[model samples]
Target chain A: ESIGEIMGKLMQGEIGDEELSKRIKEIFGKRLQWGYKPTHQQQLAFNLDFIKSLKEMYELPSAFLEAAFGKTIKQSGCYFKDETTTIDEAEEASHELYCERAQIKDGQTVLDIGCGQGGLVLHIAQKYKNCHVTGLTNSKAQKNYILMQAEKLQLSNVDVILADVTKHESDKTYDRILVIATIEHMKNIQLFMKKLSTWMTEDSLLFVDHICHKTFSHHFEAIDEDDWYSGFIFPKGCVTILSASALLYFQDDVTILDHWVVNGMHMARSVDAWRKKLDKNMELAREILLPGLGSKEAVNGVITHIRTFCMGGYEQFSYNNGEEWMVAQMLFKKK
Target chain B: ESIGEIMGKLMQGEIGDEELSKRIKEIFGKRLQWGYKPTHQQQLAFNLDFIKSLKEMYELPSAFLEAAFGKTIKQSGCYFKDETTTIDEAEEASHELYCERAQIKDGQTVLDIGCGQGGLVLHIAQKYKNCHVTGLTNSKAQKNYILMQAEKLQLSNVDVILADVTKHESDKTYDRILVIATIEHMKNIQLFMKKLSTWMTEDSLLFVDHICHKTFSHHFEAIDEDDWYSGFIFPKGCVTILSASALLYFQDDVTILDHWVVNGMHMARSVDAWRKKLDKNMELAREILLPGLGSKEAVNGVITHIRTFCMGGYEQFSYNNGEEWMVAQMLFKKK
Candidate 1:
């Protein structure tokens, strides 16, 4: 219920992202190996488990484990080592996504909320040379990692700070506040926005990126009859601005800068990639995160959200208006 | 259809694997760039698509393609590469499906069937030292690509031969004849056995891996009513050994080293992983594969198969048998 409580659970190894990622790797890797065997049925089942594994890694509060597991595993490898796999390279399209949503200017300051291992922040800073980019994450384990990436990429201006954006003080003003896919976990929407609002200067662009449901039913549809999903899954997630909470806070001053919902199916596909990458790091995870307890469910939940959202959009007949939301808030000078 | 006819289509890129893998890479890569964010519904759909991509890659006629995609995309950067992921690196309690299925004994002679781009064959030589490996692929373009891999790995004994296994003749008998997942495409099972029989000597081990049904399905309870699944999916291929023709040859003579039945559900997960990987690689693939296609539908077919198989499983009381069958066969002389 409390963020502190959740952080405790995450840190003390109550939830195992490492093991979950490993199991996912086993299940998914098996399914993948099995893929070439020509066993249609075997391929199907392994594929199902593989899909389940992908769903789990997407939603896990990886930041919570960064202090412990992040540090411990950094020995074996950092979370983002820039491998050759399609996912590892962090494609140009992603760089374009950051550019599309945020207003990056020469000699400006920018902040990336949730900046997982600093993928977006590093890119923005490197691409927009004059900008000073700071990536904020709660995991101390990533401190060395962020520095490592900066050093490796030769990013002199970009750096990462270990702090929670939601609670961190806003002494500095920024040209852009880039939050890429971090809002879904912090369910306290109003307080979160308020927390985010203080960081915004008049010309600062507050880019809050998240998934919004197309139908009122998408939330309930996931909850119905599925136990793990309804409980651990939507555990603290809310979709509709249809909620009084969402509608009450709708600010006239906040301009929807480049608001569009990316295909949920596409999102699911991404989760699948993360699951594979994360799974490879599972052993270091066990050594660093919770021991022995499996991570299948945790990663499975994120994968489910992405997968289900996609299904709701494409096959379930929500084509146009049916689109799911990946809303961003690029708040400029409130004129 | 003749194997030649199928080869013609594949060479021309008339069939869908190239386009499909590209789309899969795009969708998957995007999500990875910005973490996989989706609602439960959306995640599930994407997961299904991911599974589809994996299935489609393995099902390709070129074992090299299966190995290539498996290493590059499916294995999440494991197959041909020098490094391994956490999952790949970990010493598992169970013999992982991939490790067991891919048994590369060092300094051995192996004949790789339908080597797509020589990814697997090259992996065998590089991953395990001192091995003589021959990769067979019918497509000349594929052979040329594989040749590059051999040169990169500097495998003196690794040969990428462009020839149809069913018709090709060789004076040398293989220590291990790797059939891989290509048997599903065998139009005439008897001819298939007869053509490749000569390559096997008393010292030989026939490593025949095929995608078959879990049980003899008099009725294809697992198939979707939609024509796309039956007509387009692995068109003219036989999945399960429902027909007596499949049982005609080695059902008795071949020792079943492994008979892994991966359900359609499992395949769904595998497919999701591939879809995500492929989706991420879309930009690179667009020029190589095709245009306007993404792997979302490929993901669907896999999920559909899962759903259908799940329905047909014990829950439906139709038949409690598992779905897809991945069997490894060995015929050894008593001596």
Candidate 2:
């Protein structure tokens, strides 16, 4: 029964801060003991329905978001020089750097797959007024919110698509493509890249950002799965944790132009900041989550779970001095 | 007759600059066409005698060294901000940075395996006056040259050892061990690491610097193996080109604490500096090589080989905008 709902409870109140850290360490420690062994799981049955079901994680209320992450909502982790950086500043910095990496031009038609809360979409739309900016996600709420924001800002070039990326066929090619934190939740990655490559012009370049370990890849499985004792944070089935170089194995259909490894400390610090804000606004969070969660206790459980996930992520990303886990940015072009 | 002893010939006037660059590009280009395919290359038998043979590349006279690389002898490449930076400044900067990465202390015992010309050995001895610095190399001339420098500097902390790293055993443990630009010339790397690890104290760390690609590993095989026309620069049979993460597989006897990637342009520019110096002192270089090589034609062939090697390395390391090939620095501790 206690395992029924735990987004906030397990996160904030169940364990002391030290114990929470130690427990999170233990989860990753057990995972490390498995070593970099290859699994026979080359495929998993994932479809648009499974993608649609992921909203439990992404499609949260705006108030809940603002209370935690401030005005901007970036789904993926961003760089932070230190603990003092605000969520908004980090968001802008990360977006600008990605634009630099993606070589985004003002007049180019750009597509951002899995653009969440329209942070990158809106940023690009406003920054590149002459460019046609399109964001693809499966959530209507996400699409509507982005459109509403675009309308509020008087931006005429903003566009959002509501569909499953794997199932939906693109009618046009793009000059630039942005894929951030999306591939980890992907299945049939080779086919996905193949599909996206088809939607690229001759000179088009695709930039990908993913969380990876320094030298190993694995699935995000629970340490103890019988009773949901662990590995409950990430949405499973489509979740494949990557090694920084693992994606190189699938580059038969594309040419890798560049690869950069960003230390995981940035994400560690980012999650740490998110957790602090989440903890500070506990009452506001409960108020925002209650209606959807159906009861006060359920809201607490859900919030605890979310907060606990943040704690675990902080520990994992920062583990071994941010040297073990990493963030990899790779640039690719059609072969 | 030309193939008999054509180190300088294969390297020098046989090809024009543009053609030299193209031919070198062809050597690596053909290798690239193979595309990171896994080979059944798990083992290669190697011995100290092979290390002794590498002296043809390393044990050049002081006159030849002065003509090509100036006063310093660095068996490996160093960081150069650009083509404008001098080889001496780059050498000092690289040595200093490596010392920082290796975490050298004043009184600790340090061992530098394959320490050519004692660049790192002398730097550490001078910087930390109380530290006992030992440079291990197979060449007697290299060992003696380093000891001579130590006496001139009046540094009693400096020492030199003459032996094959694989065949020699150490009676004392070290606080820090450095292996630089030497692994490519070795075989049975796991066994070598296991042996070095045995000579490490509980708190000791080993710092390794190697050349790698972003996502592929291969041997330095010639484009065409039927003739001595290609694959002649690097000594054959022990040349394993590593991917940045390849060393992670051999961590059974060591715990990798940290890993860092240095852009290959640093080496590209470094080699460029060495080649210009060699060209600038052609007469001096020829005079330096005539006695050792035994004939004017043999000397030209050899000098040309060394110079041509620089041009090839510059292109290969700088290939794909210095993103394909890279320099990797990793820190490890006893498991």
Candidate 3:
């Protein structure tokens, strides 16, 4: 109901963005400390079409996507890298630091689940000549682009595969397995972890990076049926914003070796960059994203729609100077 | 400091117990989420004298201790044990259910770290004839009392030992290890978990039961030197009121199997029982506890001192119907 009220107010152009963000935070504060209890769906399977539609958000033209998100991927770059020496440098710096975090020893077999644009895959392959890196994704668009990039980079050890993780099967295992920003799309974490376990050798380590709130988590669900943004933007039940300690509850298959909480400021800055670039190159972004829409007036309806979520997320992480909504990186070993 | 202000207000003898409780809650509400970080002192050794003084709280005459805390131990009893059959029955019931929760199999070796008055040791010893049970405590008073009880009960399989866990060395291992309400005394949880790992076999399960708030944890320390209650009522640096997810951060040595949160109402009821009985038998407690004090007026001053904490804890847990402060039961397996 609060979501509906807030969205209606925003639609009516009656409230400022600050007020909108405050309303969002207020409703979020009302959530249970450990939120989003999906009791009935223990091992849920996402409809391929629903998942496909969700991935369509990532299907923006390469330049627009890179300009907004990152040149490499949608990763929250380490701004400290080279004094925030631009997103490109920071991304490589982030990939390097994260590789060190995951203990990616040279000559090891690596798997990047839900790999977007092959940022990590290409980097690891290029960095370690002896390593074999596999990047798996549900998007054919991403897979080929990654392969094409690997070909351009002349990295012979890079491989990209397409599969919906829930239905995908493999006899392959990895020494180092990585899941970056993919947990939000997961519904049944227990089953997903078990699947990860099957892809892990006895000495395997799974380094997972996911977005979460400091103290609570919940589904990206509308407060009521009257809400437009949540129902339209977030894929139903596929987007679960977990708490910082949420993954600890699903350790039956893997034991936690280490856990770290990154400040939300990194993510907030990421979204802010995206919003600014989108606004500056509005024409390029509009033509690329809204070719099917009617006119510029009708186009920004979708743009405003995108703007609402993008700005909302920017503010979400921006609130409390990156203390509220943040990142959790957990290192796990096979149990 | 809020603690001193509340204590002083309560000392004015002008406010209702509800008001005192409310003041206490207000002070606690100000604690940070994930509270009481002990940054210094990585591996602290308790002053045997200070720890000895703390255990002296348990040195109350057996009858008074049994009537006030429990006949067996200072544990939160299961009032649902036969419709709140009575404190004694409920204690036995709590022990039984806890044994089940820890997966105590018949005739297995069991160790209860910080075992008070041998409640669980005796229970498991009596219930499973072949089970060898060890109760470890730093209190000589508790050690002899447990031995005496076990002797009276004719349970020859029970063994009670006295040693500080931080420095104590044990070559013995058990199938099930228990640490109940003892985590508050710990300073360096990393070293403590390693100590526990030494006493665990590959298949051994470690079950830890500790008190915590739903979203935050803090020390039982005064905000300022003027806080009389925090300084006097609790031991310095020995009591850590951990958050529900606090222990999840220390999973390097042991992996979690299951975690459960019990409502604070149970603990609130336990404290309520202690307060009511102490109030009813004021003369008995006054004579027993204040054998070294002066006149009745002076005695009740110390009695008021005691009453403040008892009532404060009751109200703390009772707040939000035991949702705020509660119990966390975590089952763990050695890595």
Ranking of candidates on DockQ, top first: 3, 1, 2
Error of 2 at B32 (Å): 2.3
Residue A228 in model 3: lDDT = 50
How does each model score on TM-score? 0.33, 0.51, 0.67
Deviation from native of the Cα of residue A110 in model 2, angstroms:
50
Computed on C-alpha atoms, the DockQ of candidate 2 is 0.02
Q: Judged by DockQ cut-offs, is candidate 3 incorrect, acceptable, medium or high?
A: incorrect
Q: What is the C-alpha DockQ of each candidate?
A: 0.05, 0.02, 0.11
Please report how far candidate 3 places residue B155 from its true position, in Å: 4.7
Scoring only the A-chain of each prediction against the true A-chain gives TM-scores of: 0.57, 0.88, 0.82
Error of 2 at A286 (Å): 26
Which residue runs does candidate 3 get wrong by more than 4 Å?
Answer: A1-113, A119-178, A185-207, A213-241, A250-327, A331-335, B1-58, B73-86, B125-132, B151-157, B167-171, B286-305, B319-321
lDDT of 1 by residue, A1-335 (tens): 45456434544556565543342233222322323334443433443343233233322334423422222121111122233434433334555565765656778888887777666677677888998998888877566667887888788998787887666786666677776656555545545655666677667777655544332112321222212222333455553222101211223234232233344344333344544444555555444433233575544333344333323222222222223322222223321
**Candidate 3, residues B54-153: lDDT per residue as tens digits?**
3234355665565566667565434433435555666776788789879998888999999988788899999998999999999898899899999899
List where candidate 1 sits over 4 angstroms from the true fold.
A1-85, A89-91, A217-225, A234-249, A276-335, B1-335
Question: What TM value does model 1 have?
Answer: 0.33
Model 3 score (lDDT): 0.72
Q: Taking the tens digit of each residue's C-alpha lDDT, what string does model 3 give over A1-335?
A: 56557555666667777776665565444443334333201101111122223333435556556545667755543443333565566567668867987999999999999998889999999999899999999999889889989988899999887999888899999999999988788767778988999999899999998888655556677665444555656755467777666787667678776666667777776666667767787787778666556576566666666666777777667666776687778889887
